[PDB]
Amino acid sequence: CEYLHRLPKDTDFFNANVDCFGREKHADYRDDMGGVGSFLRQNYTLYVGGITPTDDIEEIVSRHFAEWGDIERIRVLNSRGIAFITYLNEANAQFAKEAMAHQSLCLNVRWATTDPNPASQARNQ
RNA sequence: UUUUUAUUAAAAAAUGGUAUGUUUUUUUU
Numbered sequence: 677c678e679y680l681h682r683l684p685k686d687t688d689f690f691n692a693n694v695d696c697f698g699r700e701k702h703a704d705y706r707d708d709m710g711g712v713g714s715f716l717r718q719n720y721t722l723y724v725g726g727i728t729p730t731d732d733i734e735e736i737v738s739r740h741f742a743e744w745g746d747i748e749r750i751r752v753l754n755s756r757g758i759a760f761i762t763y764l765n766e767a768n769a770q771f772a773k774e775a776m777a778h779q780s781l782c783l784n785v786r787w788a789t790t791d792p793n794p795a796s797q798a799r800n801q
Numbered sequence: 802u803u804u805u806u807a808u809u810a811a812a813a814a815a816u817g818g819u820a821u822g823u824u825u826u827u828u829u830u
């Protein structure tokens with residue numbers, strides 16, 4: 677093949693326009709947050725949704741996500757099957773997004789929305 | 802005083818006839 681079959685590592689920066697996964701990044705960031713991020717905003721966390729079996733959702737998603745890259749933050753909603761793993765790098769984040777879609781933990785993986793938390797926005801900034 | 806010749810056209814759409822307007826959520830602390 678003409679593309680790397682290995683996993684992104686820490687220093688694998690790419691140009692801002694190009695998606696780190698080889699695709700191209702638009703500007704509108706879509707409406708359903710589906711395919712590829714926007715070069716106008718820099719986010720590393722992605723919505724993953726789907727099964728809500730039991731209380732061990734945190735550990736199952738941690739096991740099923742840490743093997744895709746380096747993790748900075750994980751927040752899982754207990755009431756509903758929603759998790760918001762935050763990755764350290766764009767490369768690992770987008771690789772995980774394209775690797776955890778329609779998989780078994782089907783997962784409804786999307787891009788995260790702007791935080792409404794006045795406290796979370798401050799620490800993110 | 803014998804014979805004539807002269808030949809337009811012409812089908813389709815909208816008016817016009819099963820109006821129209823509405824309509825599904827990822828974080829707060």
Ligand SMILES: [Zn+2]
Binds near residue numbers: 677678681
């Ligand atoms: Zn390949």
